[PDB]
């Protein structure tokens, strides 16, 4: 035990050069892939707006071409999934988690074209889904493809290169280098068994893909919020209360997403016809709502800066939240290709702002700004539903750049994770994998 | 597969008892760190008061500089050799051992020894950090509450020991994230998996950071302002800086170890020659902390000055060499106090130096040496202790220049790569390995 430890200590932080060089090429590819994907979604959302201008006169005809375009593109995505790669439904992060435990296959020859071109359909149609789902799974498969193509041998190389791709995938989705790396070593990292995931190698992958992202998406931030006010020590207890509120809601949102997966499965019964058709009905509803109330539909990044500044009324915040809860469930729970990670930022922001508004008028002596509660709440749902607070915190921090709010951000987040545990909730990425694995043995 | 479904659904479930105890650990570690911080300042203040009362006679003032620092150093060195030998040097390697169940945590001894012992070495003006003391002290605080409350299990033993070590680093820098990251990057038994609960570590760090801000608000340890950005066509220069840190990283690791040896011959383990030599070094610090304050002291003072580009080229090379020398004489001679902080000051200075050369070599890039200072700051931490992700987030938390995250990562990564390929080893692991190998020798 002691003799062996001296051997281990002196051998620590030694990753074979072959793995390192390969980690670089993984990130490089994942970056370009994510960039190309990002351009596609924009290009398609652009075309949809072009068609609405060509029919800007006839109101019912305008509402028709909103629905149809979104339906046609959704159906295209839903089809590409059920026909070629079933594993590429929903997020795909739980699928990568399985692959790390050697419990799921990585069929890159299938998923890469299916998740890519399939995502372009669902995201480009205006559905309430994130890019992370697609980019993380895509990124992992890119890491497997280069393992296969270059025929690399070992448990280290199989897990490490699969991980760096998943990280560079999240990194390139948010321009968040650290959030990518932390997400792996907090959520993924086989959470019960020690692994051979080399941290140094994950880093390189993330760097390359972040650079790739900046080559094409420089001079513009995804979220601009400006520098907000500070938070006095005598206001911290208000952030802990915000955590508790997220702490009870966290698991409840997790029940709904799962339950809704079930309720939507009855509608089609596994039938590729009823599924693709229902998928288009939901997709069409989003392109419709992304016109009559754009805040209810779409990714959600657009309404974050607006919400933080306090430009919405109280009534409008409650409306947005309820409608966005509904639309988030209908898109993700119906197995569409696309993550739930980003929509959860938008929900936390909105809920946080709402709490801030109440807080502002209840305590003028504190000199509050609802915006700080928006930024505290942003990564709070991520802490109470995915149970990766340290990832959520650093993600928000990397995207909003308000370090002076690190304490409220931590406290709210920790508050969320505590009450999420004590009300019997479970990490949503783990529960979706466990349901897939339990249903895999439920027909044997 | 069946076992995995059982694991997945049981993940992130930490017994409430451990959580509530995590809170109390951090609370204690915070106050302790604060009290420790006040003491060091209090004593540095006294030393300056005595220099005023003899500000006339030049050799007389140089004497009371030496003596005060010698007397306080001796007090620290003695308190270590007499009561707790394990509390020499940093103490982070000692806590790493304790996590692998390979070293004992004698809190009844170390708490008073490291505390009052550190107050002597740090308060005397020696080139050592607060982390060493605070992390070790923090861990023992986590052991003390395990013992006093009689908590049972491998989880409770490792978790509460960890949160204290993290809350210890957090309260040393006002760096909550750097504390947590450092545990789950450096410490976390690097070869077998453990029961260290991440959620529990958080709570401890929160409470101790709150404790730090209750007494040390409205002032940051380092202010540097918002620096300029870094264009994509300039990133290759940060990679080169990493390479230079990558070759030097392991070589600085050689000297620290070699110097532990060279200084052991001087006293041979003798509590008289040790304490006396300890005072000679300690006295040299209080002397240099007057005739050239940059060469002595913790180092946080000269960081803001260096980043702004207020030093000349000659002055930067001088400070570096002198600061290399004084960093080794203080840490390698087993004095209670970390090497973590002095390494920030070295990296800053080296970074700035590279920046100055870069500025004049490339006017087309519109450079500012200050960005290379902040890139270099956590670079030596990446090349000598080989915890880059911790180093990066530490600097980030202390400088608040997120726009430099790419250069900071690139430089850091560059350092860790070339530190590996020139046969260097994580210094906190090597110091544990040497203590464990000499234990069976």
């Amino acid at each position, epitope marked *: 035990r002691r003799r062996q430890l001296i051997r281990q200590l002196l051998e620590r932080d030694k990753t074979p050069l072959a793995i390192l060089f390969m980690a670089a090429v993984v990130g490089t590819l994942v970056g370009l892939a994510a960039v190309a994907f990002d351009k596609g979604v924009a290009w398609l959302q652009n075309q949809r707006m072009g068609a609405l201008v060509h029919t800007a006169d006839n109101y019912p005809l305008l509402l028709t071409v909103a629905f149809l375009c979104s339906a046609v593109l959704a159906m295209f995505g839903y089809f590409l999934v059920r026909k070629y790669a079933p594993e590429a439904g929903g997020s795909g992060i739980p699928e990568i988690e399985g692959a790390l435990e050697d419990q799921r296959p990585v069929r890159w020859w299938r998923v890469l074209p299916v998740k890519f071109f399939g995502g372009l359909g669902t995201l480009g149609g205006g559905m309430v889904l994130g890019r992370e789902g697609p980019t993380v799974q895509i990124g992992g498969n890119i890491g497997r493809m280069v393992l296969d193509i270059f025929r690399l041998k070992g448990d280290e190389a199989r897990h490490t290169l699969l991980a760096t791709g998943a990280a560079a995938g999240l990194a390139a989705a948010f321009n968040a280098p650290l959030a990518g790396i932390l997400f792996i070593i907090e959520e993924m990292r086989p959470c019960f068994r020690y692994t051979l995931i080399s941290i140094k190698a994950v880093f390189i992958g993330v760097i390359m893909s972040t650079i790739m992202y900046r080559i094409f998406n420089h*001079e513009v931030a995804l979220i601009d919020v400006g520098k907000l006010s500070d938070a006095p020590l005598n206001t911290l207890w208000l952030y802990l209360i915000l955590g508790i509120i997220f702490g009870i809601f966290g698991p409840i949102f997790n029940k709904w997403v799962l339950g809704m997966q079930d309720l939507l499965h009855r509608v089609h019964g596994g039938n590729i016809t009823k599924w693709v058709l229902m998928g288009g009905a939901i997709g069409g509803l989003c392109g419709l709502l992304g016109f009559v109330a754009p805040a209810t539909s779409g990714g959600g990044f657009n309404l974050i800066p607006i919400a933080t500044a306090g430009n919405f009324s109280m009534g409008m915040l409650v409306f947005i939240f309820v409608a966005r809860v509904i639309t988030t469930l209908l898109c993700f729970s119906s197995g569409a290709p696309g993550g739930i990670f980003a929509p959860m930022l938008a929900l936390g922001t909105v809920l946080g702002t709402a709490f801030g508004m109440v807080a502002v008028e209840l305590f003028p002596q504190y000199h509050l700004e609802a915006g700080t509660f928006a930024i505290a709440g942003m990564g709070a749902l991520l802490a109470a539903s995915i149970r990766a607070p340290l990832t959520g915190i650093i993600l928000v921090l990397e995207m909003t750049d308000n370090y002076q709010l690190i304490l409220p951000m931590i406290i709210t987040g920790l508050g969320a994770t505590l009450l999420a545990q004590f009300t019997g909730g479970k990490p949503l990425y783990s529960a979706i994998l466990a349901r897939t694995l339990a249903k895999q043995e439920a027909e044997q | 597969r069946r076992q995995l479904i059982r694991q997945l659904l049981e993940r992130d479930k930490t017994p409430l008892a451990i959580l509530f105890m995590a809170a109390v650990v951090g609370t204690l570690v915070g106050l302790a760190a604060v009290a420790f911080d006040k003491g060091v300042a209090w004593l540095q203040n006294q030393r300056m008061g005595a220099l005023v009362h003899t500000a006339d006679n030049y050799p007389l003032l140089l004497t009371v500089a030496f003596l005060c620092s010698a007397v306080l150093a001796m007090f620290g060195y003695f308190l270590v050799r007499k009561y707790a030998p394990e509390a020499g040097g940093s103490g982070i390697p000692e806590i790493e051992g304790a996590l692998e169940d390979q070293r004992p945590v004698r809190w009844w001894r170390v708490l008073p020894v490291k505390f009052f012992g550190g107050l002597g070495t740090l308060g005397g003006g020696m080139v050592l950090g607060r982390e060493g003391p605070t992390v070790q002290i923090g861990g023992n605080i986590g052991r003390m509450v395990l013992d006093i409350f009689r908590l049972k299990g491998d989880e409770a033993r490792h978790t509460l020991l960890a949160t204290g070590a993290a809350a210890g680093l957090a309260a040393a820098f006002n760096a909550p994230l750097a504390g947590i990251l450092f545990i789950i990057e450096e410490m976390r038994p690097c070869f077998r998996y453990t029961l260290i609960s991440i959620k529990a570590v958080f709570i401890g760090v929160i409470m101790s950071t709150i404790m730090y801000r209750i007494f040390n608000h409205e002032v940051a340890l380092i202010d540097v302002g918002k620096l*300029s950005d870094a*264009p994509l066509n*300039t990133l290759w220069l940060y990679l080169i800086l990493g390479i230079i840190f990558g070759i030097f990283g392991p070589i600085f690791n050689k000297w620290v170890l070699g110097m532990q040896d060279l200084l052991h011959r001087v006293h041979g383990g003798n509590i008289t020659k040790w304490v006396l030599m300890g005072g000679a070094i300690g006295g040299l610090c209080g002397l240099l902390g007057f005739v050239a304050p940059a060469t002595s002291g913790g180092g946080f003072n000269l960081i803001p000055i260096a980043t702004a*580009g207020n030093f000349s080229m000659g002055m930067l090379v001088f400070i570096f060499v002198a600061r290399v020398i004084t960093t080794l004489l203080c840490f390698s001679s087993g004095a209670p106090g970390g090497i973590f902080a002095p390494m920030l000051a070295l990296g800053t200075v080296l970074g700035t130096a590279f920046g100055m050369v870069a500025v004049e070599l490339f*006017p*087309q890039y*519109h450079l*500012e040496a200050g960005t290379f200072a902040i890139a270099g700051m956590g670079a030596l931490l990446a090349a000598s202790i080989r915890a880059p992700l911790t180093g990066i987030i530490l600097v980030l938390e202390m400088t608040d220049n997120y726009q430099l995250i790419l250069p900071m990562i690139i430089t850091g990564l560059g350092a860790t790569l070339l530190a590996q390929f020139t046969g260097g080893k994580p210094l906190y692991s090597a110091i544990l390995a040497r203590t464990l190998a000499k234990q069976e020798a």
Partner: antibody
Amino acid sequence: VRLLESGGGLVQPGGSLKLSCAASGFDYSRYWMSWVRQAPGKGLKWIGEINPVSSTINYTPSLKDKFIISRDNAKDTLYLQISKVRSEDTALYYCARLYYGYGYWYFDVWGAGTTVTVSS
Amino acid sequence: DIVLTQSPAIMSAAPGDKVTMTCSASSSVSYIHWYQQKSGTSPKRWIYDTSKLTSGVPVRFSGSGSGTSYSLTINTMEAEDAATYYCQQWSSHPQTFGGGTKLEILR
């Protein structure tokens, strides 16, 4: 965002004048600022540049204190003093804000210009 | 200091024509910028880093080239394009401007 430069007009040969450029609409203490000139009917010629913290000031190959560039972040103004003026300095002086894409710096936003006539 | 030379000093074209003017350098330049200066107006940053368009610049414009030759191209030129176009580099120091290419319209 607007750059409004002023202080031009008539100056004697051998004399000196101080040009100002008042800036507004952007965080002025964040950008490098520059001066470019254009003689009547001719092309553009870079004069100088100055970083926000006034520590770096590069000029075109000129004499001693031919040009002197300074900035006052409190007033949001860029200054240019020209010494020992000869007819080659009879031009239109643009005050420009500097920036980059990949890193190869360009003249982002230009002012309207002030004219200087060196005549008797 | 690198000397930029712009091929046609003055050129005439009728709207609808494809138009190309050239910026040639004495040494080796990378990522050059173009400025438009219409009559009695200040130069406006038009094309940057060789081929990127500034916001508001119509898609009819395009830049390219590398090494010692760079070009600005108007695909189907339009009458509103009557201006003098200056190229500029800052890959070396000091940065330097071209001579100008005055575009005139045939109507």
